[PDB]
């Protein structure tokens, strides 16, 4: 499948190799929950591991399923 990543410079989406089928989106307010806040992470994953009350990650089983919460539509 294909998931969205935020490791590179800009945000893009690739096809996870023969290992990961699910995507993930991490969120946690960076010391600016008022201004900046919830840090947005992007990446692929095979399964949905645990998650702390703060640094949580939403895993899904679909393509381009882990887009930025405030990503521009189009």
């Amino acid at each position: 499948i294909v998931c969205h990543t935020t490791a590179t410079s800009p945000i893009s989406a690739v096809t996870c190799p023969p290992g990961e089928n699910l995507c993930y989106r991490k969120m946690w307010c960076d010391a600016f929950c008022s201004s900046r806040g919830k840090v947005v992470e992007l990446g692929c994953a095979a399964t949905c591991p645990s998650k702390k009350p703060y640094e949580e990650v939403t895993c899904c089983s679909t393509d381009k399923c882990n887009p930025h919460p405030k990503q521009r539509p189009g």
Partner: peptide, 13 residues
């Protein structure tokens, strides 16, 4: 580095 919810730009640390 990653991005914050307040924007879509890259954010280093």
């Amino acid at each position: 580095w990653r991005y914050y919810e307040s924007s879509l730009e890259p954010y280093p640390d």
